[PDB]
Amino acid sequence: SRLDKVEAEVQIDRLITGRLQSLQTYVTQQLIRAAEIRASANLAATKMS
Amino acid sequence: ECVLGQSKRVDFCGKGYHLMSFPQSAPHGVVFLHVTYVPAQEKNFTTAP
Ligand SMILES: *[C@@H]1O[C@H](CO)[C@@H](O[C@@H]2O[C@H](CO)[C@@H](O)[C@H](O)[C@H]2NC(C)=O)[C@H](O)[C@H]1NC(C)=O
């Protein structure tokens, strides 16, 4: 609303970089948690058998 | 526990009662040939403690 399409890109790229980094952090931590959940599920599958 | 021995762990090396296993080398991995004893042809009987 305040800036024209050339001054707006300077700010929108900052927002995009930051939000993409937020998503990347979320996905990285989900992978690290899924590894531990998978270790627990393998232990539970061993205890079942 | 399955090439260098006989495992009593259930379903650790094949489905059935483990007899022995044979390792085969695959690309980036390993293949185990689990030889098990599977009971067959059951028959009903009367029993007592
Ligand atoms: C052991 O006995 C059971 C009971 O008779 C057998 O199971 C039955 O088999 C018949 C077919 O012949 C079915 O119609 C019944 O529903 C089964 N169950 C029951 C609860 O009666 C079973 O086949 C026998 N097992 C062997 C290996 O002979």
From Swiss-Prot, chain A:
Changing residue 1 to A: In strain: Alpha/B.1.1.7. Subunit of the fusion protein that is processed upon entry into the host cell. Mediates fusion of the virion and cellular membranes by functioning as a class I viral fusion protein. Contains a viral fusion peptide that is unmasked after S2 cleavage. This cleavage can occur at the cell membrane by host TMPRSS2 or during endocytosis by host CSTL. In either case, this triggers an extensive and irreversible conformational change that leads to fusion of the viral envelope with the cellular cytoplasmic membrane, releasing viral genomic RNA into the host cell cytoplasm. This is Spike protein S2'. It comes from Severe acute respiratory syndrome coronavirus 2 (2019-nCoV). The lineage of its organism: Viruses, Riboviria, Orthornavirae, Pisuviricota, Pisoniviricetes. The gene is S.
